[PDB]
Design a protein around this motif. Sequence first.
Motif, PDB file in Angstrom:
ATOM      1  N   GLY A   1     -14.912   2.521 -22.972  1.00 31.99           N
ATOM      2  CA  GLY A   1     -15.481   3.809 -22.608  1.00 31.99           C
ATOM      3  C   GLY A   1     -16.061   4.519 -23.819  1.00 31.99           C
ATOM      4  O   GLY A   1     -16.246   3.910 -24.885  1.00 31.99           O
ATOM      5  N   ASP A   2     -16.351   5.808 -23.667  1.00 25.83           N
ATOM      6  CA  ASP A   2     -16.983   6.568 -24.736  1.00 25.83           C
ATOM      7  C   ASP A   2     -16.146   6.539 -26.011  1.00 25.83           C
ATOM      8  O   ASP A   2     -16.692   6.526 -27.116  1.00 25.83           O
ATOM      9  N   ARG A   3     -14.822   6.537 -25.855  1.00 24.26           N
ATOM     10  CA  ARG A   3     -13.923   6.650 -27.009  1.00 24.26           C
ATOM     11  C   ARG A   3     -13.866   5.409 -27.896  1.00 24.26           C
ATOM     12  O   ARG A   3     -13.289   5.445 -28.984  1.00 24.26           O
ATOM     13  N   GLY A   4     -14.468   4.316 -27.441  1.00 19.31           N
ATOM     14  CA  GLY A   4     -14.614   3.145 -28.287  1.00 19.31           C
ATOM     15  C   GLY A   4     -15.531   3.393 -29.467  1.00 19.31           C
ATOM     16  O   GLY A   4     -15.488   2.642 -30.443  1.00 19.31           O
ATOM     17  N   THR A   5     -16.354   4.441 -29.385  1.00 20.45           N
ATOM     18  CA  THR A   5     -17.309   4.755 -30.441  1.00 20.45           C
ATOM     19  C   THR A   5     -17.325   6.237 -30.833  1.00 20.45           C
ATOM     20  O   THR A   5     -18.344   6.907 -30.677  1.00 20.45           O
ATOM     21  N   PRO A   6     -16.208   6.741 -31.383  1.00 21.83           N
ATOM     22  CA  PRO A   6     -16.205   8.128 -31.860  1.00 21.83           C
ATOM     23  C   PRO A   6     -17.176   8.271 -33.033  1.00 21.83           C
ATOM     24  O   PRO A   6     -17.297   7.332 -33.827  1.00 21.83           O
ATOM     25  N   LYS A   7     -17.841   9.414 -33.165  1.00 24.93           N
ATOM     26  CA  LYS A   7     -18.839   9.557 -34.224  1.00 24.93           C
ATOM     27  C   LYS A   7     -18.210   9.560 -35.616  1.00 24.93           C
ATOM     28  O   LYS A   7     -18.765   8.973 -36.553  1.00 24.93           O
ATOM     29  N   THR A   8     -17.075  10.241 -35.759  1.00 24.56           N
ATOM     30  CA  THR A   8     -16.442  10.405 -37.061  1.00 24.56           C
ATOM     31  C   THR A   8     -14.935  10.247 -36.939  1.00 24.56           C
ATOM     32  O   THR A   8     -14.387  10.140 -35.831  1.00 24.56           O
ATOM     33  N   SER A   9     -14.261  10.255 -38.082  1.00 26.41           N
ATOM     34  CA  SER A   9     -12.806  10.284 -38.090  1.00 26.41           C
ATOM     35  C   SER A   9     -12.247  11.638 -37.685  1.00 26.41           C
ATOM     36  O   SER A   9     -11.088  11.731 -37.268  1.00 26.41           O
ATOM     37  N   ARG A  10     -13.057  12.688 -37.838  1.00 27.58           N
ATOM     38  CA  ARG A  10     -12.626  14.054 -37.554  1.00 27.58           C
ATOM     39  C   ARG A  10     -12.721  14.396 -36.072  1.00 27.58           C
ATOM     40  O   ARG A  10     -12.041  15.315 -35.597  1.00 27.58           O
ATOM     41  N   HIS A  11     -13.567  13.661 -35.354  1.00 30.36           N
ATOM     42  CA  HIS A  11     -13.856  13.941 -33.953  1.00 30.36           C
ATOM     43  C   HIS A  11     -13.172  12.966 -32.997  1.00 30.36           C
ATOM     44  O   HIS A  11     -13.798  12.423 -32.077  1.00 30.36           O
ATOM     45  N   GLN A  12     -11.880  12.752 -33.231  1.00 31.90           N
ATOM     46  CA  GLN A  12     -11.053  11.913 -32.370  1.00 31.90           C
ATOM     47  C   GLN A  12      -9.632  12.438 -32.450  1.00 31.90           C
ATOM     48  O   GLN A  12      -9.229  13.007 -33.473  1.00 31.90           O
ATOM     49  N   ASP A  13      -8.879  12.273 -31.368  1.00 29.82           N
ATOM     50  CA  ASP A  13      -7.445  12.518 -31.408  1.00 29.82           C
ATOM     51  C   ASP A  13      -6.742  11.373 -32.125  1.00 29.82           C
ATOM     52  O   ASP A  13      -7.296  10.275 -32.270  1.00 29.82           O
ATOM     53  N   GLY A  14      -5.497  11.623 -32.519  1.00 29.07           N
ATOM     54  CA  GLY A  14      -4.608  10.559 -32.947  1.00 29.07           C
ATOM     55  C   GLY A  14      -3.379  10.553 -32.061  1.00 29.07           C
ATOM     56  O   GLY A  14      -3.064  11.556 -31.411  1.00 29.07           O
ATOM     57  N   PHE A  15      -2.676   9.425 -32.033  1.00 28.14           N
ATOM     58  CA  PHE A  15      -1.469   9.283 -31.217  1.00 28.14           C
ATOM     59  C   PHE A  15      -0.491   8.370 -31.925  1.00 28.14           C
ATOM     60  O   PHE A  15      -0.915   7.434 -32.603  1.00 28.14           O
ATOM     61  N   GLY A  16       0.808   8.605 -31.760  1.00 24.72           N
ATOM     62  CA  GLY A  16       1.791   7.639 -32.220  1.00 24.72           C
ATOM     63  C   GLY A  16       1.811   6.412 -31.322  1.00 24.72           C
ATOM     64  O   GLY A  16       2.272   5.338 -31.721  1.00 24.72           O
ATOM     65  N   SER A  17       1.314   6.598 -30.099  1.00 20.15           N
ATOM     66  CA  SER A  17       1.243   5.585 -29.032  1.00 20.15           C
ATOM     67  C   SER A  17       2.615   5.186 -28.477  1.00 20.15           C
ATOM     68  O   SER A  17       2.881   5.388 -27.283  1.00 20.15           O
ATOM     69  N   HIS A  18       3.481   4.625 -29.323  1.00 17.57           N
ATOM     70  CA  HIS A  18       4.828   4.241 -28.886  1.00 17.57           C
ATOM     71  C   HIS A  18       5.692   5.436 -28.536  1.00 17.57           C
ATOM     72  O   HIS A  18       5.527   6.527 -29.077  1.00 17.57           O
ATOM     73  N   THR A  19       6.667   5.192 -27.675  1.00 15.29           N
ATOM     74  CA  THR A  19       7.813   6.070 -27.549  1.00 15.29           C
ATOM     75  C   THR A  19       8.690   5.945 -28.796  1.00 15.29           C
ATOM     76  O   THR A  19       9.081   4.839 -29.197  1.00 15.29           O
ATOM     77  N   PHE A  20       8.971   7.087 -29.415  1.00 11.39           N
ATOM     78  CA  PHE A  20       9.949   7.178 -30.487  1.00 11.39           C
ATOM     79  C   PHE A  20      11.136   7.999 -30.009  1.00 11.39           C
ATOM     80  O   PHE A  20      11.174   8.459 -28.856  1.00 11.39           O
ATOM     81  N   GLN A  21      12.109   8.200 -30.890  1.00 14.26           N
ATOM     82  CA  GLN A  21      13.253   9.030 -30.540  1.00 14.26           C
ATOM     83  C   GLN A  21      13.394  10.178 -31.537  1.00 14.26           C
ATOM     84  O   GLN A  21      13.118  10.017 -32.723  1.00 14.26           O
ATOM     85  N   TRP A  22      13.784  11.344 -31.032  1.00 11.81           N
ATOM     86  CA  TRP A  22      14.158  12.475 -31.865  1.00 11.81           C
ATOM     87  C   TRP A  22      15.642  12.712 -31.646  1.00 11.81           C
ATOM     88  O   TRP A  22      16.131  12.630 -30.510  1.00 11.81           O
ATOM     89  N   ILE A  23      16.363  12.973 -32.728  1.00 17.31           N
ATOM     90  CA  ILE A  23      17.786  13.276 -32.630  1.00 17.31           C
ATOM     91  C   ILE A  23      18.047  14.600 -33.344  1.00 17.31           C
ATOM     92  O   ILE A  23      17.583  14.808 -34.477  1.00 17.31           O
ATOM     93  N   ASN A  24      18.769  15.501 -32.679  1.00 15.23           N
ATOM     94  CA  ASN A  24      19.056  16.814 -33.255  1.00 15.23           C
ATOM     95  C   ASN A  24      20.313  16.803 -34.135  1.00 15.23           C
ATOM     96  O   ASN A  24      20.946  15.754 -34.318  1.00 15.23           O
TER      97      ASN A  24
END
Lengths: 514, 514, 515
Positions: free
Chosen positions: C195-218
Amino acid sequence: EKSAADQIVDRGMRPKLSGNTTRHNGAPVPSENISATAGPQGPNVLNDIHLIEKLAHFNRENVPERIPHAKGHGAFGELHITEDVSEYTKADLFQPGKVTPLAVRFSTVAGEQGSPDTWRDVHGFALRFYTEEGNYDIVGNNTPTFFLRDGMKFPDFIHSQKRLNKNGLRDADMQWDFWTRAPESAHQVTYLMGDRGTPKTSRHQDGFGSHTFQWINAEGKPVWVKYHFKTRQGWDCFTDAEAAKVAGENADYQREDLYNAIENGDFPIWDVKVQIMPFEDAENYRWNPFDLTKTWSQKDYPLIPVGYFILNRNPRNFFAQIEQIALDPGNIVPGVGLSPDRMLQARIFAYADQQRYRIGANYRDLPVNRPINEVNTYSREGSMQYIFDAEGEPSYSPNRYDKGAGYLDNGTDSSSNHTSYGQADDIYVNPDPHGTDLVRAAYVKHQDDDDFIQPGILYREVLDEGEKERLADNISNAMQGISEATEPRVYDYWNNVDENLGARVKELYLQKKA
Amino acid sequence: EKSAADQIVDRGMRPKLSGNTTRHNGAPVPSENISATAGPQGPNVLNDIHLIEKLAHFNRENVPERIPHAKGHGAFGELHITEDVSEYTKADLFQPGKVTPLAVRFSTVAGEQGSPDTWRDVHGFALRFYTEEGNYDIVGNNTPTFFLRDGMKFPDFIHSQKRLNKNGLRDADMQWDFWTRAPESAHQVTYLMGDRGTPKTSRHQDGFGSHTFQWINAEGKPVWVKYHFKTRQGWDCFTDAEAAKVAGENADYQREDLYNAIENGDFPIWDVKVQIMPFEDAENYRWNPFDLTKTWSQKDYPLIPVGYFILNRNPRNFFAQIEQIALDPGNIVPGVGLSPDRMLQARIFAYADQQRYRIGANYRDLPVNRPINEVNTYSREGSMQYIFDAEGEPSYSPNRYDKGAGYLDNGTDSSSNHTSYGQADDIYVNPDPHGTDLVRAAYVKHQDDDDFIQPGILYREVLDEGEKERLADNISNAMQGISEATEPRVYDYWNNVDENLGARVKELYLQKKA
Amino acid sequence: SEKSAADQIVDRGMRPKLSGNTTRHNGAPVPSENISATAGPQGPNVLNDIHLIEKLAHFNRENVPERIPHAKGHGAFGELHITEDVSEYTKADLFQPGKVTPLAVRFSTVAGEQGSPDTWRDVHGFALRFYTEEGNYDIVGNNTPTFFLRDGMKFPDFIHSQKRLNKNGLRDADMQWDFWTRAPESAHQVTYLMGDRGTPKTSRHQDGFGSHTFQWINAEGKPVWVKYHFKTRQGWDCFTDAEAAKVAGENADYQREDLYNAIENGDFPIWDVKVQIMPFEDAENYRWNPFDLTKTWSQKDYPLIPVGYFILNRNPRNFFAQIEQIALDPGNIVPGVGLSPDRMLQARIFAYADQQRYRIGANYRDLPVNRPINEVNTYSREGSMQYIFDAEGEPSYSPNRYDKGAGYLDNGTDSSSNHTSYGQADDIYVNPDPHGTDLVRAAYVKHQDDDDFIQPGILYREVLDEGEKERLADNISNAMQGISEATEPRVYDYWNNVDENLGARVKELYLQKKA
Ligand SMILES: NC(=O)C1=CN([C@@H]2O[C@H](COP(=O)(O)OP(=O)(O)OC[C@H]3O[C@@H](n4cnc5c(N)ncnc54)[C@H](OP(=O)(O)O)[C@@H]3O)[C@@H](O)[C@H]2O)C=CC1
Ligand SMILES: NC(=O)C1=CN([C@@H]2O[C@H](COP(=O)(O)OP(=O)(O)OC[C@H]3O[C@@H](n4cnc5c(N)ncnc54)[C@H](OP(=O)(O)O)[C@@H]3O)[C@@H](O)[C@H]2O)C=CC1
Ligand SMILES: NC(=O)C1=CN([C@@H]2O[C@H](COP(=O)(O)OP(=O)(O)OC[C@H]3O[C@@H](n4cnc5c(N)ncnc54)[C@H](OP(=O)(O)O)[C@@H]3O)[C@@H](O)[C@H]2O)C=CC1
Ligand code: HEM
Ligand code: HEM
Ligand code: HEM
Ligand SMILES: [Cl-]
Ligand SMILES: [Cl-]
């Protein structure tokens, strides 16, 4: 208990740490004792991050040892100039009153890491001076001479001193087959087979540059020099049997001795002296003055005092500062040059070449290898680049900025338009090359040049009767195991040094062959 | 004079050559003796191509030694199956009548490449069998047990056996500080400090897999096994003093002995036997059957004969075939599995990890490391890739071609759609994990599990009076040099093994000290 | 000027500006950078031109192995600012109220080598390091919330299929689609990629994601499952397939240059840091397996919860030293953060440090950009190029009679024998039910709506606008050019399985362009 070397040896050292350990990212380590499993009796999990990091870094602790001189140890200290040799050299570290930090590494030659310090062998005696004009290394030995006069033969000699390809055993037949077929070896083999083949410690031996080097003064006048480091502790040697006993008792006898001596405040000292041969004396000397197998007689060229050096600082970390030191005869500085000694010229290539492999492309940036002054270079990148140039500085010269170029260059162009600089005195002021062609030729033949006269002089004119007998005894011990084919070659070789020595060697060899 | 190993040891070997030497491009070498200069007394020229090639390759001869087990030597031979163990294992090399080529490497543990074979130490006993279903390595030692039960502690133990960071010296205080603070070490330290710490040769010692492994038969039924290699030459040991004397006389005594024995046709043999513990016996054994520091009593599990192996071939080239062999307990084959021994599980990762660094990414392709069957892998490239797949074969699976995938896979897709294969018996048929969570936990505690009972039994029920006394004498010798801070910890450690041993150790130690 | 909290980090290892004349690496003056020494003007070059050989030899050793994958990339430094209170969920130091933490980032493509264009169609890497007070915490993410596979065993297969044929060094459409259609778990990410997101114009004009599930512990030890979302303040902005290919030729370093220029000009890019938080007890009954990387968590079920923002405000001082040599690693976790039974993640925790030990060296952790801000207390030693070493005479082993210490679970004085247990390894993660007691090779636990195609089908049918849907089909049919006749029906079926209308349009457009 301070040392001029403190600046150097403190580089790279962490403060003392306590509490709990961390992983290499700085996060706290849960345990150094128990690994994580899926249930107490279940399989080890992949994601015990500390386990894997700990094992993987452990797995990569070792690096190639030096070839040769693998087994060694060292210290740091100070060079003190006490005489005025400014007439002869402009080298900064040798000027009156100069005090310069130093490193030294001592070693054997043939054996690997962990081999005994007291195997019969030459011992390395390799100094670094951290001078104001760069690191100047004098990578010497405990002998004024050596086995060969051409670097082409060096790998042959070193394989012959190491292990047979088939079975990993060192071998007497191989050592003597090489030595007798390379009779230029006779001078050093005579030295090696005598008492000095087994010095008790690193402190109880002289050191030498061995090669002829050049000194050049402020006015550009060259003289030929040889370095002598005369031990204040004195030569002190084991017998052949004693050296072997110590090898079994303490394979690190000399390493331990030097550590202990410095830890106890018993700082060893050597007086630094030179022989100085005027440039005009070289062509007519009775021996070729650039042949490493020929010493200059001290009756012709007496030792001239320069100063002394003292070892007053043990390393903070042996591996980081001694195993990783990169001592290199090519580390020369202004006021010092080379000579037409072909062994030396091969060495000027070989050490940095090995160090690029043994340590890494960026070995010069490690704490013990950096000079005291800033390095201004266009070199860049390479594995494990820790140090880099100021942001945006140019990578090429000539350039339109101010980083600069060589001292002969103008800093603004490539020296085209047929620019010449002239004689490369910084390499050395050369003597007559005696030919106009690329050749493979003998050294210029001087009146008394042969392979046997100097060790014969040692035997007949220097050694006392006990030294002569022990020499024959040591040789005949070293001969045990040679083949029948090799026997007469060895007889002939020693006869050529001296017929009385040769006769006695054969006599003792046959008695022991049983 | 033939060996089944001949196919393997001939791989990579050049024919005998004569005439003149060539450069590495195959062009004739002008001289091995004299380098080219610009005039006889002129400078060495840059373009002596052979000189530089000879020096540069010489400079790269050395590679990182193993950590640990750097000092070793080996041979090739044959495994012969003489009994029918097919009811227990389907492993191809163990089926009736099978004769399989082998390699073996023997070693010490702590010392580096040049260090004496006869320092007091464990000796490695590491076998490769070149089987029809791949290389199966049993990387064992000359002891049925070891110092630790968790790989997390392995680098701690090995640094404690090697050299202090400050000065490159091995250190008694460090060795005993670690051993007494890690008292799981007591079983192996007792074995090490006895006569077997100094076997005379590689031929005069038993070998052991040490760990519990698993055997699985054709029907998928598992049993737990331990390997014993019983020397036909018999155990033969130096005293502490004799071993040190030999270290000084011949640092390569054991290497030379094995070479000589085979050269002389005196081929050493070991009987291959196993202990076999039924799967249902494990949880209820008096000791934890997966704790490396616990042996299985031979009163409970007698040795069962499998066959024998014989060493009848010296290497053609020591460096190429022995230094570069990559022996790895992860080299298992069908019919053999692992166990919940945490030491073993760490080893299954660690060896290949080190070998990728020590040798190179493509170490598996070296002649001595290749199996007899063709390797069908999607791995590619890497430094020094000698072997590559048939032209145009696919680099990925699943694919539309024929190269294939795993035996559990269908060869056409990725096993999505919720495909399951079930129990990973090829790793091992696991026992109960005794929990459902990722944990850091003790081993399951069996009735007689502690750190001291087994060496106590050795002392009280097995050793004769001379053995008991030499043990105390050896220990007290090894204690010389420990700090006053460490002395009472060592006294207590030995009392935990046995009160009478402890009393004698302290008595002899105090007699020898000061 | 413009100061950055990252200044401390980026100044490490940098020489002062130098002038005058050059020196050799021993510090001695260089005679010439222009002319080499010869035996006579027309004579042979001499061996002992020390500077010549040193200059050539170090030049010869400039290159190092590029990353596999993600070879082509670029980066910057900056600051993480916390603006919300998430202390009920995590005790991780960098995430506590008001915390400001220096950061590094590297952006990248995946398949191409070092010299290849930034704007080839590809996933883009989005890899962050936070230099926290409790160590370096790296979130090595991508510009997609999902990925192509759910088992690390398959990762080298996917990456070879995206790289070059063994015979001729050419990338290959047939290989890419043969792999993708035979590994249908790829459908979610391939739909995103095409889709469109295969070709973002710049590094600044895209989201980032960790993708995986991680864990937070309090602080009390309670775990929750989390996913990271880095929402661009610059906004998604994408080239068309044709535009991206044109830019690839015009400026292969378009995105590298854009980021450098933006920061030089003071146009510092910002991302808002947010998380999805799934209660531990929600995991078993979620409609999708919550640990399957190919499954996103619906934002209707788990909305984004704000944490703070990060800003990129410092260019590197030296690209090779600080970006090429950075060693970003998802295994760089810190207290308060854990992993999950995502098999891709678990393979990654091994793989990065393993490659870095080779790519850079055993002591890569000691390089300026890789060192944390706190002191490392380790028993590791030696190895090639050891620059940093412990205080003189400190012990090399634990347990020991000194003070250097051991792990926080240990007592520091013995080996934890006598049957010592520490219990659940929460620092790895608080595990859910393993659903079995045996070593197995098994499917993920099957949740109600788990399959390979529903999520990209949902993206197509419920999220994309009509223009996005059409461009998607057009992009796919372009990427299919060059596949074999054998592969054609596999690709037709694959797209039909995502959505029958998408599949029909893909085949229509493909055949228009083929013939
Ligand atoms: N010329 C030199 O640079 C050196 C030469 N030699 C050897 O001495 C011979 C004569 O040289 P020359 O300078 O004319 O004469 P000298 O008498 O002036 O010097 C002889 C040298 O030999 C040393 N020496 C004494 N015993 C031994 C031994 N057991 N093994 C090795 N060396 C020993 C002496 O050391 P000491 O003063 O302590 O007795 C002295 O340095 C040479 O052929 C050479 O083999 C040896 C060392 C240096
Ligand atoms: N169980 C095992 O696999 C082995 C155990 N041991 C030790 O023996 C103890 C009893 O074991 P168990 O099998 O029940 O009793 P066993 O009597 O059946 O076996 C005792 C074993 O100890 C060996 N041994 C003899 N002398 C020494 C010594 N000097 N140093 C080390 N080992 C020696 C014996 O070898 P030999 O028959 O040639 O005399 C024999 O293999 C154990 O606690 C263990 O320490 C030692 C080796 C193997
Ligand atoms: N759940 C998640 O973490 C994400 C899911 N998606 C996709 O959206 C589907 C529905 O997810 P859900 O969260 O339930 O629904 P939502 O409507 O809540 O979210 C849809 C997401 O898709 C994004 N999106 C919009 N256009 C495109 C496009 N051109 N290509 C890729 N993504 C785009 C949206 O971004 P925006 O708000 O800017 O329009 C939004 O983040 C999923 O199956 C997945 O394929 C995509 C990104 C994140
Ligand atoms: C052509 C002849 C020679 C060649 C090619 C040669 C080459 C080398 C090389 C490559 C090393 C390893 C360097 C390293 O990896 O750090 C080495 C070590 C050493 N060499 Fe030589 N060498 C030669 C002759 C000599 C001579 C004549 C001497 C003394 C005058 C000498 C003294 C030493 C010393 C002392 C070391 C060890 C330095 C240290 O302690 O680190 N060598 N040699
Ligand atoms: C967790 C504990 C251990 C770890 C992590 C470990 C790791 C290693 C490694 C990495 C090597 C070097 C391999 C190479 O570079 O080729 C090695 C050598 C060796 N290890 Fe271990 N080891 C462990 C315990 C053991 C045990 C229990 C035994 C015997 C049962 C053993 C026997 C050997 C032998 C014989 C060698 C030398 C192999 C050869 O001759 O090439 N080790 N070990
Ligand atoms: C099991 C699947 C995967 C494995 C085995 C794997 C392995 C690797 C390795 C070994 C590197 C090179 C690292 C280096 O040398 O510094 C790398 C690069 C990278 N990977 Fe993965 N990867 C996997 C999947 C993923 C996923 C799912 C993501 C994102 C969520 C990801 C993001 C990245 C990024 C951003 C880089 C470049 C980091 C940088 O800019 O330096 N990878 N991967
Ligand atoms: Cl190299
Ligand atoms: Cl590696």
